[PDB]
Design a protein around this ligand. Sequence first.
Ligand SMILES: [Mg+2]
Ligand SMILES: [Mg+2]
Ligand SMILES: [Mg+2]
Ligand SMILES: [Mg+2]
Ligand SMILES: [Mg+2]
Ligand SMILES: [Mg+2]
Ligand SMILES: [Mg+2]
Ligand SMILES: [Mg+2]
Lengths: 127, 114, 100, 80, 151, 98
Amino acid sequence: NQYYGTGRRKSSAARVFIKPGNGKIVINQRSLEQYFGRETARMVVRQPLELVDMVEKLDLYITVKGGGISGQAGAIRHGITRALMEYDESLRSELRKAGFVTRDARQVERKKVGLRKARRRPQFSKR
Amino acid sequence: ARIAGINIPDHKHAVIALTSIYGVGKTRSKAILAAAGIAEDVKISELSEGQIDTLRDEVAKFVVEGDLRREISMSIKRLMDLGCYRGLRHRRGLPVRGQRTKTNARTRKGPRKP
Amino acid sequence: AKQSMKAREVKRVALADKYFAKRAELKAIISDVNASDEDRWNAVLKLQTLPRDSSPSRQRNRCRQTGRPHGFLRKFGLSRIKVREAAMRGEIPGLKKASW
Amino acid sequence: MRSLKKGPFIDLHLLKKVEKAVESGDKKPLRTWSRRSTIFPNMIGLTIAVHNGRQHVPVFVTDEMVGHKLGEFAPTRTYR
Amino acid sequence: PRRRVIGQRKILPDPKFGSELLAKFVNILMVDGKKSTAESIVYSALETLAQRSGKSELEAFEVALENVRPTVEVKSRRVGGSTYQVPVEVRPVRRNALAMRWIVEAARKRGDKSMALRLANELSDAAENKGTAVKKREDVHRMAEANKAFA
Amino acid sequence: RIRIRLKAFDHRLIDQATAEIVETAKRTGAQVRGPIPLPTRKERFTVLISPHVNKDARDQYEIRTHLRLVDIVEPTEKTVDALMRLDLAAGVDVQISL
RNA sequence: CCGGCCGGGAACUCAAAGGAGACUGCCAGUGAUAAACUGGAGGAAGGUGGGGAUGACGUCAAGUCAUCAUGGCCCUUACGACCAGGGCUACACACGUGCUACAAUGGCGCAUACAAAGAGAAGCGACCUCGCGAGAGCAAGCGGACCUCAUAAAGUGCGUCGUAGUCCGGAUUGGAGUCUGCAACUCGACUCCAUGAAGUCGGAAUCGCUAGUAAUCGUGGAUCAGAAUGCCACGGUGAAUAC
Ligand SMILES: [Mg+2]
Ligand SMILES: [Mg+2]
Ligand SMILES: [Mg+2]
Ligand SMILES: [Mg+2]
Ligand SMILES: [Mg+2]
Ligand SMILES: [Mg+2]
Ligand SMILES: [Mg+2]
Ligand SMILES: [Mg+2]
């Protein structure tokens, strides 16, 4: 019935269900336009779909938890590509050719003792 | 227009035009306008004399420019001639709230002089 | 650390559980909106008659093995140096070196 | 005692000492080591002596000095 | 560096035009790492650039850039009691990302009201071959001829 | 109807106690929910390394507190009698709420 | 009563136990046919994938006799011990590490999305009422994936301020207060009203940073009755450049 993908970009884990039909996307019981608002957050969701040009073919039910704006928006882009990974099989090579499949494991690193912020040392004056 | 001491600034919002009165800041200026029935967005220039007339008497409920400076100078004089601690700090021109004078307190002491 | 100072801490402990576990009404019970006559003024006056040793205000909370006033740790009860001397040897259970 | 809910403060030893003085009025200066106590209007006209750390200096009471704590009128550290 | 040669990162295109060249422009203009207001200025000045003069919005950008790209720049090497600035040709990849830095910096000194108005005014000036960005480009070009005896 | 939550400073030791408790529950015959791992608590400390200055050099420690829960549901009269002092492990907290 | 709210399900995010994975493993080329190097496929990850812990023989007779122990030397009706007050916070000046700004990619007002980590028993303290506010009163819940701290902020939408020492800046000062605490003057934090200083991008010189980095925005904890712009830790947005 349904097909699934997770997405886990930068401490925000999503979950996407892809339904054949028309083109409508509901995320966390809200519409796509009103949840994000940022033009770099409602196209990055769309980027996997426009590349395969299905866009108007799939009905999406989405719940996203944790993270921020671009973290969640990036996470969805991961899950959608993973959702598309399931119910079609010959599409992997093209989808991977534009990213969307690499998890992009870049997290915030430690503060570190002796360092002021995370890599910045305090000002060093010799005398 | 013309309030207790003087109200020079036209072309400014009324809520922020009365702030030029020595004793009216922002929370009181907001209060006085509401008490007199005048909104905040309305400019002082647009105000017909049927409004500023009530403004020249509303400020009489708060001590203002005409007397506020006399009281503060009297307030400081009482401590200065008393001989108490805060009088001594005023006498020498040093901080009176008990803070650092070892390095800071340029505002109270004055410009950096060797 | 200067055994004189160590004896102060237990003298102030002894007078801390002796009074301010029972003679707390004056500073807690008779402080609020109630009969506003001199009985409250008696409570304020009578609280000073007790010795200077109050419960929180005069406890330095020093280490248990050396009596070091500074660097205390409330959880282990030792200073910041005895914790590493009651060490990674294994005296403290489940306390290993952290790396995250 | 730094709140109206608690009430103005004076030490018990000072409070009983001043009560005896007013019973006989002005007398020899009162020597006291208390500096944390407010000034009550019952000791106007006395010349109590506070201890700044090395010596007892006599502070003359006046109606104006009725809300300030006793130590205010004894400079504890000298300078020039 | 000195040991490891390395390539460059991948830039996501802008959400309104899909051009990477303007995707870097919102990056250069951005301060404190807030692309939200950084992109808000860029399109605002890009829109009023199209209506004022020229056609399109992604085309009036490329015409302007042609008048601020430096062909040759001077690099200084230390020899003796002084230094000689020896000219050297600039590779195209540096050339684009250098002109944009000149445009933004010159458009932060404008006397206009908001950055939206300043950026569009300077961009229109570039296409008309005037302004303070093209002022720098000519100077970098002029210095090359002065020190072309040291080439 | 009775919850047994187990706390310990090492996972291998806490598994020794939770393994017998289901076995005892299996010995009661049936109806065990199965141990569930609750989130772990980790306290991190940072003490200075020297008796003196060089504040910039420190040591960071951490104590973990592993968690388990078995959630016994059917209280047989022989379940209560047999579930006292049969942990066969030292240094493991036990807490039973009715 | 569209509140996971209720039966209910073990799929999904997640929790925590155990495994699989990455090894120049495979292909082409260069290489003294070798070590290895440059690329290609697959892969979530590609050449020690990112970070941490880990610091050889020794140097500075570097620091600590004030964490502690100890060789000597010394006071031992004292250089030991107890107590009240004061000082460690003093100020013609100089240096170091930081916070706040000097504004329009901002100030203020209204409305509204999205976190992670962490703490709690003479402790964290909902709810409701009161107070312009710090906060006060009664006062549930929780030694805790449930109860509290705890409304995250930068952002987004709307409105105004039009380049002024300004609706920027918040020091200083007068008055009025709240909470700990025997006790707030010396010398606490915080709140209300008024005042509004220097500051309009900083001389010589000099510091940090190569990617979730710098920059920028907020939350937590240790110490702690009260008292950090410091210290330690977490996440959100997120660069430029390496010839
Ligand atoms: Mg950060
Ligand atoms: Mg204390
Ligand atoms: Mg916890
Ligand atoms: Mg190693
Ligand atoms: Mg003493
Ligand atoms: Mg000091
Ligand atoms: Mg000036
Ligand atoms: Mg505290």
